[PDB]
């Protein structure tokens, strides 16, 4: 197996949609690599269109949890939760390849039922929305207000543009 | 046509689910009847599980928009928007046959999309929930708080109970 | 129209499954005939497997609502709601043909959602059950305690037995 | 026929999704009324959730093409293209019932294919977005820049609010 | 593989929904690990949207039937039966990552059939509701009346909130 | 394993449609080889119809990222993103067997939603279109204008014609 | 209309599968004929494969209910419930075209549910089976056991054979 | 494999629906456990909603057929055939966890075809029901008619209830 | 009939997709008027997206076949064949309401089968593209090669621009 | 593995439909065998109905690209691409079993979209058609024209016929 | 593996339908055995209803192609291409178990398309029909007229009769 060999050089790949499975896998690889040696850096390469929000959150909070610095490298693209994760890389170790595409946006979902239930679910999504915009601003240096204004609709940008935005530190040019 | 025959007797039947199509039917018939005679009463027999809200309201607004007093008679059942319309009949002229069942509740719905749009949908549903609770309270004699408490979940009652509640005036039994 | 011709002689056919649609038709015919002649009896022929409770109930209440006697004649079969309605015919005018089978039972139904919502529904169907049993025990002369056990499960019987149980008065022949 | 009957008193109903089909009908009806009497006002009652843009525009153009005034009345709900039509009625003859709701927003669409085709579709939808926004602004007394900001997402209003916003002239209550 | 590598570290994973399939795996490990050593703690990391009540009850009973302490760690999300489980972790060893979400609610379900059948399922689902609300109160300190009021409809909360609420002990940071 | 054995001799097979899953593998594979020997050349045999744009880009960026020279050999066909990657091989090491088909075109996409969202998707696809026509112009030694003009519609070629164009360096006789 | 015109001559046509709607129709016609003239014989043309038992039964009871003689004519075929209804025509007037087919058998059915429910459906179907076999014996000349032994499985006969069996009287050849 | 590991400890898990596939497996293991050592107990963990009957009985006959004692432990739940197997564990070694649910009932099923085929299937369903009741009375200490009245409908009990009833021996709390 | 009345005033409506069904009706009506009054004008109101090419040419040839001028008035839109037909109106009598959108383009179609069959299909689609590109050219004064370029991809126009372009003559604003 | 042990003798099998997936396997085995011994011959057994043109071309090129002589053996049948590949075997080493059947034809395909697009694809398929005729003509020594005539429609042959035609060298008797 | 165990005994099993896939397997096994020992016989056990002709034919040619004799044993059944294959075993070594059934018939197929295309397919199939009957003829010793006349339709046989026909040499009873 190839991936298992890359896991030996402390490289974990995050490709495609993000969900409990994928997250569960990506989380297990982080806990694993840490116990393996809680002082070396881990390379999290990202090429995802996004995914379920609480999933992306588990991968994230696990990134802060473990001792090793989790560096993030964007190849191909990192949209939705994919861009959020890329920004959560250890400060200074968030990279991207020249032709990658970064896109951030607000969450989306669905509500079904009585007025009392739609409202509950609605406030819950706005909450996740504020939580991720909050983290997205803190990670980039942009203000809360600025993030809200830009994630209102799909905000696509090049790696280079992503750098001047605060999302990544260096474009491996 | 049997329904055409009865309409010549000022009888309008609202049976089954409510929607624009059914609503247009009921509205055209209420208008028509007025054009034939603005003085006489109109008989609106109801047997509905409710249906689309904006559609129910079109009917409701039409009842008050025409000169004739619209008598509402419940038969079989008057649930949700169906019960709403029942309670809108002309004061003192809201009846129900002895074994009908009346039910009131809060509106149902669905939101899909960005956090921003789900909330707009949500606020709209609540807006209508508050609209109907206030009309319901005014038609029965109950207070908003009371209406809101009972319509939180399905409130099923008997014609007799419906009269005690204030949704109808007499039980033609 | 072959069906209209019959109605001209106060004959109404309840054939098939009973729902708000069929229900409305029968009521429109029942109300119509009372406008034509509020004294002459009506012939409600019944060949139906049964149907939606409130729909049948709207038919039962209309039968007692108008002034003329609504005589019921079972042909083919009369089960569930149908058997119920058959037994509601005007005292002494509840008929059936020789090979017609009659079957009474307890109401069927379904509930999906939260426990709160499930309990509300369960309670409603139970109220309808009791209501059915009581009106059935009063149409046959049987005791509520008798109807209760007898309808716990499908209870099929021929015209004769039904004459002796109390559901119908006579077997035309 | 209840509908063709009301058309005699010059009433035209537009309820449900608006498409070339429904449009053709609404169109024919206006051209027919135009003939019957180029002077007498026409009453276009609206209860529609919207529909295909061009189909909608064909009605509006016809409203203006013909000689008689097309008064618009909203019952139940006038949303999207439906809200557009309500706003285009003869100045001073745009009414709404008290409990109807008005919802305006920007156009929806879809593009599939090559970059070149999508770009073309995209410009065509945007050209349309600006067209209606302009007319809507002109009919409401709002500024182009304002209708643009307010229709960025679904804007739900109450008859009373829609009257204050400039979309309708009077709320028959 | 990776999960089995973590299992030897006494780290069990509950990701995705809960049903017998998953339940049996969890129970398999909670027994296995108590076979390796009934002394050393066990780490059950939870990231589940919920699942079947009896399935979760299985994992629950097994959790405190074995001898070692089963510590619960909510990562990402712990709603419905997922939250119930999280709170069931060993007193003092219930954690959550900074950005995880918790949600408690009343059971969901459905029933079809005769009134009798529906009534049995309704009371059954009511017991589980009472049962869980009870265990939930003990585990948090909260009274039964409170858990009952809160779980009526979906009760979402943040990690800090869950701690103040008594569902978790410490929040890692 | 036949594929693991060819990878031993530093041969990587890119067969079929391109997507994140497929691209992820190719990426994981290049990384493996770059690690095993940063000095030696890697041979990438392509027989693809094209695929997900960013997915192809992830691959294009990795080839230039790693230290080894990535030679590209087209067998069967390299169409769309496939021909793109082909032309991106190490200058002087871009090959093709005598009967391969090469086709270059412009990106294909789709969009649904508000005009604002379509416009966003539209601009994003044009941005990507501009990027690839420009990289293709660089890789072929032609004016961006000419490539734009050619790729407007699917442009097929014979391995020989591809060499004339500048996409490959030699046709292995 | 063609069928309407043949009705004028007292010709009722029973074709294809017999269910509650068709039965209803045949029934309407028989009562309508007797209306016009309660003496003039009726011709019931049968070309049916059979159908639902209760539906057939209603036709059979109705034939005998009304005063008029209902002469049955089998053309093409008369199978199952359809052969049963042939043998029930006015004795001496049960015909058959030369090349028609006749087929008699035991009822078909289905049951799903609890053992208790299945048993009730078993006795019920066995009841209908004996009743049918009973009448068949009555109608032909054959003894209860013959009929039973014979209808155990599909039993096809020619017009002539059906006469020798005692199912029809003459064979209009 | 984890289950294999639990097997070495002589622990067999029966979870989910029961059928030929699952029964064939449980018997394979059951027999195997005997080959190793036919003296030590066997721990049959049960978390099942039930399943096919003949499959359940095959497991049951194997439990008594093998030389060792097959103890039963209920976790999560054991309803229908699931509760049956639980009550067939070695006398005295029938356990249950504290919050487990135990439910017993009468067999379910279906039948299609000729009346005589239905009678045949019905009798087999009844004879199975009888075999079931007897065994499920002999194990519990209840009487035939007692177990018969109680299993007429779903009969849900708690761990403690099942013991008081005789289904289990001790609730491992 | 409302459409029939409009016909008596020499008004024909081509609404929606064009196909053989629709085409036959328009041809039917034109020939009707043809005979009705060979000298008076015919107004062809168009609001179509396009359709079957030959079906359109059908209508068109009929337009120039008959003696009376066929005026064309675009309302809503006239795309693809709809635009072709629009322009094919009698010289000087080609209108459109102000907010209508006109669109021209090259043909669409498909081919399955052998290389030889595909080429045949291909030449034929090219022949039609040529045929129409010239008719369109003639009707608007545009050079054939200019048209072929403008319609290479969907070319959307406003009423005014369509006048400028030569597709229509006037705009009734 | 049977095929694997077989591959150990330079024996490769091409069974079923040819496509990229199947083609990549074959291509990998050819590259594998060559690397394993560019001297010994390789035995490619073909029993295929054909498939994707480029998939076959992919294989064909690799056959001549590697050093070893690739001998082709036809068992069962070789049609379309199968035939083609069979003929591409090392001269003097193209065999076939006595009863296998060889069948050659012209490529099949499909095109959708605009005339412009249809034409591009038609020319592309005619390009492949000509290329393959050349190769067949050359592989067999027949004239470009003879191959043209003979592949117009499906041309079935016996191994012996295929031999005398030039497609194979000898038939294993 | 169980089958690889029997392969060590030159035992090949042919179960179910025959197609390229299944046949490749048999062929592979046949070749492997010939390699292992070109001397020792082979045992092909058949229990197949037949399948693709060319697939079957590919197995037939391989049996004769290898050195050892391939004895054929019919177990269960051998119909169509199955019987054919059984009849193709080395003379004197064609067996069948006592209760096996053998069935021989003519080719089955289907053609679609142009008259020209269907004519070809029809001719090719007749060709195989003649081909197999001929083979069948000399494998059984029967004349062609007789094989041709006997397989015109499905011809069923017992092992005893099949031996008497010339399809097998002995019945291992």
Per DSSP, the residues of F33-45 read HHHH-SSS-EEEE
**Angle in degrees, CA F64, F70, F75, rounded to 5:** 130
Chains A and F touch (3+ CB pairs under 8 A): yes
Tokens describing residue A137: 């601003």
**Angle in degrees, CA H24, H26, H28, rounded to 5:** 65
D26 vs D19: CA distance, rounded Å: 10
Instruction: Write the CB contacts of K23 (distance below 8 Å, at least 6 apart in sequence).
Output: J15, J47, J76, K52, K55, K56, K58, K59
Q: How many CB atoms lie within 10 A of CB E142?
A: 18
I128 vs I53: CA distance, rounded Å: 8
Q: How many CB atoms lie within 10 A of CB I19?
A: 13
Pairing of strands D101-104, D155-158: antiparallel
Q: Using DSSP, state whether J86 is helix, strand or coil.
A: helix
Span between the terminal Cα atoms of chain A, in Å = 30
Tokens describing residue D15: 């309820």
Tokens describing residue E170: 């410490």
Maximal C-alpha separation, chain K: 52
Cα separation values, G90 from E117, F80, G8, G86, G131, Å: 48, 81, 20, 9, 19
Q: Using DSSP, state whether C59 is helix, strand or coil.
A: helix
Listed residue (J142, J144, J123) closest to J132, CA to CA: J144
Cα separation values, D30 from D10, D66, F70, Å: 9, 8, 70
Resolution attained, angstroms: 2.8
Instruction: Write the CB contacts of E4 (distance below 8 Å, at least 6 apart in sequence).
Output: none
Sort out which chain A residues have CB atoms less than 8 A from B116's CB and list them: 106, 152
Contact F60 A100 (CB under 8 A): no
With contact defined as beta carbons under 8 Å apart, do I89 and I44 qualify? yes
Q: In sequence order, which ranges of E75-165 are alpha helices (DSSP H)?
A: 81-87, 115-140, 144-151, 159-165
Sort out which chain C residues have CB atoms less than 8 A from E118's CB and list them: 109-111, 121-122, 125
K89 vs K93: CA distance, rounded Å: 7
The H or E element spanning position B29 is helix B20-36
A65 vs A56: CA distance, rounded Å: 14
Q: Taking the mean position of all CA atoms in its chain, how far away is CA H91?
A: 13
Q: Taking the mean position of all CA atoms in its chain, how far away is CA I61?
A: 10
Query: Closest partner residue to D153 among B23, B29, B117, by Cβ?
Result: B117
G83 vs G71: CA distance, rounded Å: 14
Contact I119 J126 (CB under 8 A): yes
Instruction: Write the CB contacts of A119 (distance below 8 Å, at least 6 apart in sequence).
Output: B122, B125, B126
Q: Taking the mean position of all CA atoms in its chain, how far away is CA D25?
A: 15
The H or E element spanning position E95 is strand E94-96
Q: Using DSSP, state whether I17 is helix, strand or coil.
A: coil
Residue A129: φ, ψ to 5°: -60, -45
Spell out where B49-107 has E strands: 70-79, 94-96, 101-104
**Partner G contacted by C156 (CB < 8 A):** yes
**Partner I contacted by J114 (CB < 8 A):** yes
Sort out which chain I residues have CB atoms less than 8 A from J116's CB and list them: 106, 152
The H or E element spanning position C2 is helix C2-7
Question: Which DSSP state fits F141?
Answer: T
F82 vs F77: CA distance, rounded Å: 8
With contact defined as beta carbons under 8 Å apart, do E72 and E100 qualify? no
F163 vs G3: CA distance, rounded Å: 79
Chain D: closest CA distance from residue F131 (Å): 13
Nearest residue of chain B to residue A154 (CA atoms): B114
Tracing tokens 């999207």 back to the chain, one arrives at D80
Contact H98 E23 (CB under 8 A): no
Q: How many CB atoms lie within 10 A of CB E127?
A: 14
Nearest residue of chain H to residue G148 (CA atoms): H116
Nearest residue of chain F to residue A79 (CA atoms): F54
With contact defined as beta carbons under 8 Å apart, do I59 and I86 qualify? no
Pairing of strands K155-158, K101-104: antiparallel
Q: How many CB atoms lie within 10 A of CB D112?
A: 12
Q: How many CB atoms lie within 10 A of CB K21?
A: 12
**Partner F contacted by A46 (CB < 8 A):** no
Tracing tokens 């709390």 back to the chain, one arrives at H173
Contact D2 B61 (CB under 8 A): no
Q: Using DSSP, state whether D112 is helix, strand or coil.
A: strand
Tokens describing residue H63: 């439990």
Q: Taking the mean position of all CA atoms in its chain, how far away is CA G71?
A: 12
Spell out where chain G has E strands: 11-15, 42-48, 70-79, 94-96, 101-104, 108-114, 155-158
Nearest residue of chain D to residue B54 (CA atoms): D76
Question: Which DSSP state fits I19?
Answer: -
Which value, in Å, is the radius of gyration of the alpha carbons in chain K? 16
**Partner G contacted by C99 (CB < 8 A):** yes
Contact I115 J109 (CB under 8 A): yes
The H or E element spanning position H75 is strand H70-79
I95 vs D62: CA distance, rounded Å: 13
With contact defined as beta carbons under 8 Å apart, do G41 and G71 qualify? yes
Q: Taking the mean position of all CA atoms in its chain, how far away is CA K16?
A: 12
Instruction: Write the CB contacts of I149 (distance below 8 Å, at least 6 apart in sequence).
Output: none
Q: How many CB atoms lie within 10 A of CB K153?
A: 7
Q: In sequence order, which ranges of chain H are alpha helices (DSSP H)?
A: 2-8, 20-36, 53-65, 81-86, 115-138, 144-150, 159-165
B96 vs B84: CA distance, rounded Å: 14
Q: Using DSSP, state whether I10 is helix, strand or coil.
A: coil
Q: Taking the mean position of all CA atoms in its chain, how far away is CA C134?
A: 14
Q: Using DSSP, state whether B7 is helix, strand or coil.
A: helix
G108 vs G131: CA distance, rounded Å: 14
Span between the terminal Cα atoms of chain J, in Å = 29
Tracing tokens 């089995």 back to the chain, one arrives at E4
**Neighbouring chains to H with at least 3 Cβ pairs closer than 8 Å:** E, G
Angle between helices A115-140 and B115-140 (to 10 degrees): 150
The H or E element spanning position J17 is strand J11-18
Listed residue (D82, D70, F114, D62) closest to I99, CA to CA: D62
Tracing tokens 């039409």 back to the chain, one arrives at B62
The size of the G-H interface in CB pairs under 8 A is 72
Q: Taking the mean position of all CA atoms in its chain, how far away is CA C80?
A: 8
E165 vs I23: CA distance, rounded Å: 71
Q: CB-based burial of residue I107 (10 Å sphere; 0-12 exposed, 13-18 middle, 19+ buried)?
A: buried
Sort out which chain D residues have CB atoms less than 8 A from I26's CB and list them: none
Interface mutation vs chain H, best among G50, G115, G121, G123, most H CBs within 10 Å: G115
D81 vs I94: CA distance, rounded Å: 27
Cα separation values, G151 from E59, G61, G103, G128, Å: 58, 22, 9, 13
Sort out which chain G residues have CB atoms less than 8 A from H111's CB and list them: 109-112, 118, 122
Q: For every residue of A52-96, which 3-state class applies, written as one string?
A: CHHHHHHHHHHHHHCCCCEEEEEEEEEECHHHHHHHCCCCCCEEE
The H or E element spanning position H101 is strand H101-104
Q: In sequence order, which ranges of C13-114 are alpha helices (DSSP H)?
A: 20-36, 53-65, 81-86
Q: Taking the mean position of all CA atoms in its chain, how far away is CA I99?
A: 18
The H or E element spanning position C114 is strand C108-114
Tracing tokens 């390229």 back to the chain, one arrives at K20
Q: Using DSSP, state whether D144 is helix, strand or coil.
A: helix
CATH number of H1-173: 3.90.226.10
The H or E element spanning position H74 is strand H70-79
With contact defined as beta carbons under 8 Å apart, do D94 and D87 qualify? yes
Tokens describing residue B156: 């099923």
The size of the D-I interface in CB pairs under 8 A is 81
Instruction: Write the CB contacts of H158 (distance below 8 Å, at least 6 apart in sequence).
Output: E127, H100, H101, H102
Tokens describing residue B21: 């199509």
Half-sphere exposure of G150 (CA within 13 A, CB side): 20
Q: Using DSSP, state whether E44 is helix, strand or coil.
A: strand
Contact I76 D64 (CB under 8 A): no
Altogether, the residues listed in chain G come to a count of 173
Pairing of strands H42-48, H70-79: parallel
């Amino acid at each position: 197996d190839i991936y298992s060999r890359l896991l030996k050089d402390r490289i974990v790949l995050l490709s495609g949609e993000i969900n409990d499975s994928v997250a569960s896998s990506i989380v297990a690889q982080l806990l694993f690599l840490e116990a393996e040696d809680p002082e070396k850096d881990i390379g999290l390469y990202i090429n995802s269109p996004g995914g379920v929000i609480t999933s992306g959150l588990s991968i994230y909070d696990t990134m802060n949890f473990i001792r090793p610095d989790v560096s993030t490298i964007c190849i191909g693209q990192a949209a939705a939760m994919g861009a959020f994760l890329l920004s959560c890389g250890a400060k200074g170790k968030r990279f991207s390849l020249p032709h990658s595409r970064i896109m951030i946006h607000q969450p989306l979902g669905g509500a079904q039922g009585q007025a009392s239930d739609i409202e509950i679910i609605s406030n819950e999504i706005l909450r996740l929305k504020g939580l991720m915009n909050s983290i997205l601003a803190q990670n980039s240096g942009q203000s809360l207000e600025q993030i809200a204004k830009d994630t209102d609709r799909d905000f696509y940008m090049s790696a280079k543009e992503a750098k001047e935005y605060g999302l990544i530190d260096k474009v491996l040019q």
